[PDB]
Amino acid sequence: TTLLNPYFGEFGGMYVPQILMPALNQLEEAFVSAQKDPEFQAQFADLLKNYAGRPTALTKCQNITAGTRTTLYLKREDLLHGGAHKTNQVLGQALLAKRMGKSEIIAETGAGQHGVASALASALLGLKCRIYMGAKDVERQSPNVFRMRLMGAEVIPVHSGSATLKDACNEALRDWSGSYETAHYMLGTAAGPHPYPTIVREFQRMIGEETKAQILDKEGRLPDAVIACVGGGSNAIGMFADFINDTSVGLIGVEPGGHGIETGEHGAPLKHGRVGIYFGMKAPMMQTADGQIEESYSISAGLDFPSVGPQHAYLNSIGRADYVSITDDEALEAFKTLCRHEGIIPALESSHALAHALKMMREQPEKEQLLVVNLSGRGDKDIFTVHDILKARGE
Amino acid sequence: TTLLNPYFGEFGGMYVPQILMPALNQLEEAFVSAQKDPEFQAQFADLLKNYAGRPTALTKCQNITAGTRTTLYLKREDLLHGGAHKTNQVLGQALLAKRMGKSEIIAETGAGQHGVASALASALLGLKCRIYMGAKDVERQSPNVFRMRLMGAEVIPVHSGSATLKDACNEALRDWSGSYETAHYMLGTAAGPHPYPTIVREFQRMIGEETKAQILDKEGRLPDAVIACVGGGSNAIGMFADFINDTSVGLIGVEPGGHGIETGEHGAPLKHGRVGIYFGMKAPMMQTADGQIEESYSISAGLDFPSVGPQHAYLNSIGRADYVSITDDEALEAFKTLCRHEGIIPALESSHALAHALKMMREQPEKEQLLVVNLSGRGDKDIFTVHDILKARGE
Amino acid sequence: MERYENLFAQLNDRREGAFVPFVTLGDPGIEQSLKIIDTLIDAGADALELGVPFSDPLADGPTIQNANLRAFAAGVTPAQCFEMLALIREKHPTIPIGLLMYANLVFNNGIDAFYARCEQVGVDSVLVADVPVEESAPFRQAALRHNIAPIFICPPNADDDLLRQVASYGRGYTYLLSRSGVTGAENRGALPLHHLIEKLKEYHAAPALQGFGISSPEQVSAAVRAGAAGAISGSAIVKIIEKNLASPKQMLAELRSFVSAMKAASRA
Amino acid sequence: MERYENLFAQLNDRREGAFVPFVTLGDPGIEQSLKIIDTLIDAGADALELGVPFSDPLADGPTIQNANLRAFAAGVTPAQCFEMLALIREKHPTIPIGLLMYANLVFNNGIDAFYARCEQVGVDSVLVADVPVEESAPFRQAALRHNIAPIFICPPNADDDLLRQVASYGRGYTYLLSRSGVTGAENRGALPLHHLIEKLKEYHAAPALQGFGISSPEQVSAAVRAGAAGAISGSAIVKIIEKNLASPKQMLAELRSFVSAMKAASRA
């Protein structure tokens, strides 16, 4: 029994060991209570404004759309404290943890941005934070490992499986199933068992709410499309939520295409996987013929996950949102282009969304279109990875 | 002849080779013209808001003042696009460069934050940017070197002298004296020949203006003191300017004490140097008995400079502002303390200001005082340096 | 069939508890796994709990994670597990056989077809580790249609509504969880909770088998004396496999010694 | 004294321009520097421009930056430069001697005391490189009080107000800058600007010496034919020092050859 619907059509649910059900129910009740609590809402709003820096800017690109009929704005979540959108919902969940009398936090991280967000919120709010991170990601997103540790978080490398986000997810959930009495699992994406996809969306929806107010102010109308990259789905659902009922507004989610869909080395289950049960949810996943979970791949650690949040699977199924993929090389070109022509260094995850928007423009350069890209994070964490690639490439 | 006063009491002036005087006069006339130009002001305001992210938050510390009568707020210039206050005045100067028909930019950088700011503004506004950086700083602030280059800026290591900020300054000025016909020198601090200390102050003064509005809103009164670190003086004068006429408001500038004033390895000329002429200005400087310019030292590249802006020398002389020093070890403790107790990773430069505020609190813990620290930048650029130190220290 | 019912009736007549080892099918290879299983049975196992190797076993600690990995390294697939199961049942007609499954392996090519395969090879129960009672409907329905017992979990902090649902929906045996966390021999299960054991009996639940962290004869005796119908041990058995990979004869001797001792303890 | 006035009157009588080498005092050491200077004079230098080593010479390119560094490596201080100057004047009573200074070295322990020291050793002019006419008052006042000529710079893009101020405030000679930028033999000065040369004469300015990038006899001839009273060469002379550090005799022979050729060119 739940207070809220755990499903989005066929997708979602609470596919966890029985031991964890009371924790999920407790979380859901605490969330419902907090959502109607003016003191909670005021505390959360104050942290977002005065600590995290909201509202974040909406920047019109000045150069990259030259010579086309595309007007492109970037929602600047890269300016949020911590350097990505992850910080928004971490502040809300940290307050819920406190509300439930918990004093410890478990989190998984891939890009290290959710881990940084979790560490910073725990330092601020007096929680003991431990973060699981795949060993491959400890290497390719190393600046975030140093940031997490300086903030007093324990960072636990995960060597099992693919040593990437799914494996950090597995360890976090294993840990929680033994420590839930004292630890809150601060899941960092719009995926996993209910109530997480719902809470994460509700604690990210200020992204789209602000976008709407800002585009109305600057353009006097809604966007033709809003475009966001999709790992587990939090930044995309945060951007999408407030536009769902605005039927004219296109919702475009961008999965990582890795080395190319045809190679099997990607992270695009929504369009190229099939429905399975894993990580507490029924959702599209990359799986073998026998139902073993496949290892994903992407140049970007934040997108390197073989599943996707169930609300995205649902929005796709009914045709309300469209999902596409962008390869590693397309993402890199978009990264370079934004650095050199707009003076913004984007996260490689966010560069997938940008790459798609650039494609929309370039493919149809006389199509009148007003687009918003969710610039989910800054690329400081990626600069060594990108440098090394461009040098090996002979640039 | 000038339109504006090049001096602050005894300090300042235009001590450059005769060849450069027309460039300085041209810059001054362009600045005066732009200051009364509503279109210029609107363009600058739009970039600050929609591109850089202003106004920046004013954060009340929740934990670090516990048990004392100190209320401490941090002015969050670490949230500005690029990661430091440097971005504010770069946007204004870049617009002046364009206004004067120049298409190239020269800048010096120490911490690499002014260089990053210069590179980003040049990418946005279509200027060809070259940045001089001391070779020691290329090493200890390396993340900023990668950021500058990804944005298409040329980064020129300077091996001469101390291979730090003063040496990058020397090369930038040498370059400008041959290239001024086509290049604007985007000096990054409130120092050098007139009109730079004036322009830099006027293009940074939004820091203190916003601070005042924000403290009035939250506290219903002015701060007892505002505290800022002082390299060449831009973030400090940006914070101070709007409070100069509020006689009750203490203005405290923090110079780097390095390994300790007594060792001679510091960057604190305002309090421990003597008046000299160098880098186009008459100002306090670290100099030998014979008048050779001494090499400075600080753990922080942004503060590692053997002089100081002439308006600070002036404010000190008349007792309107007080100047103090903070050692490397004091700065490091403040860095660690903010990371672990407020979930903010400060620049090591900004950590000098914070360290002083923490001292004010700790020395007199029952003194009622409302303080603002200018948190001039984020410490991403410092994380490898700080890690290496704390590990060598056995932590 | 009625293999659990017959087993428990026999154990009751002998005033004895069940000892039920867990292993991963095909660990360290198919042939050795079959020999291991025959050794477990010959040494006194009353029933078996058998793991199908799964890529991401979220209820298992490192010991059994590593069993799954050894099976995959030997190229074990669920199809090969079903071939093994057929061979085990062919040798051992009455021993109850329960599968430990993760949901995706059951859901993969159709829930109904999965349980139909289980019936064909003669499996008696299926425990789907990541499907709580709240999500169990199509699983328990398919199980019962194919004469398979769906096994549900009674955790230490089970409330009354949960006790009633587990008693109603489950068949074969009730899983009495020793503790929170994941499988592991080093993390010792708590003493069996008398109140849950008694409430399950009051609600006519399938007999309880205590599991998680049971690695010693003393814990088996404690479970039975507390009123549980028996105990399950996985990680302790698997460690004997892991320790003796280069010594297959010593492996079987140590498995036999351990299983015999754990079974002796079930008579307390 | 009147050493520049006497020199230019003599040069005019001979219908000849001046050749004025620059070196850094004490490069590569005090003794060798003194020999270098005697060699410059014996080879035909009409006047000297002499650098006091300074830590941050912002109007100088790498060649002269490196001269300053060699002098510092030899432990040269301004005090030792004044001792050298006294010795040079003692040997050579009439040759005009001009110092190239940076402001801090003049300002350091009092502007007046600096120019008083210059007078005592018999220096004729001081050029302070980073003090424009706009900041020059206390410098030119102190210079004139101590019978030292303050030298000012006429850049290529000098306007009329500047030409008038340089003509009025300067004495000894007027510096006619060849080009923008910093000192350097590789960056060749532009042809002397006839209009500036003629305007300076119209305003009764001290005679003009062209400098920056003059490294060949042809450029010396071009400066004189354009109406300048002579030319200064620094980096070209200094490179001969830098090239021959391990060969002090070859150094002086090459300095002599070069200076003789540059002086011959001043008669064109």
Ligand SMILES: O=P(O)(O)OCCNS(=O)(=O)c1ccc(OC(F)(F)F)cc1
């Ligand atoms: O002895 P240990 O600690 O290794 O425990 C072995 C248990 N093996 S098992 O098949 O019964 C078993 C039973 C239930 C499990 O998860 C669930 F409770 F969530 F369903 C996992 C394994």
Ligand SMILES: O=P(O)(O)OCCNS(=O)(=O)c1ccc(OC(F)(F)F)cc1
């Ligand atoms: O031959 P080069 O190119 O080395 O030039 C040598 C010139 N040496 S100097 O003392 O006359 C000399 C004169 C003026 C200088 O700077 C100023 F113009 F700003 F004042 C610097 C050096």
Ligand SMILES: C=C(/N=C/c1c(COP(=O)(O)O)cnc(C)c1O)C(=O)O
């Ligand atoms: C998984 C991680 N990051 C994901 C991420 C993503 C993708 O995750 P969502 O689909 O949940 O937004 C997008 N943008 C940025 C900057 C990100 O850091 C992490 O930091 O743990």
Ligand SMILES: C=C(/N=C/c1c(COP(=O)(O)O)cnc(C)c1O)C(=O)O
């Ligand atoms: C000199 C540099 N930085 C100085 C600096 C300073 C000191 O310079 P000002 O005194 O000009 O603010 C303070 N804070 C931050 C974050 C800084 O980066 C530079 O980035 O080039």
Ligand SMILES: [Cs+]
């Ligand atoms: Cs456009």
Ligand SMILES: [Cs+]
């Ligand atoms: Cs994904």
Ligand SMILES: [Cs+]
């Ligand atoms: Cs306080």
Ligand SMILES: [Cs+]
């Ligand atoms: Cs300084």
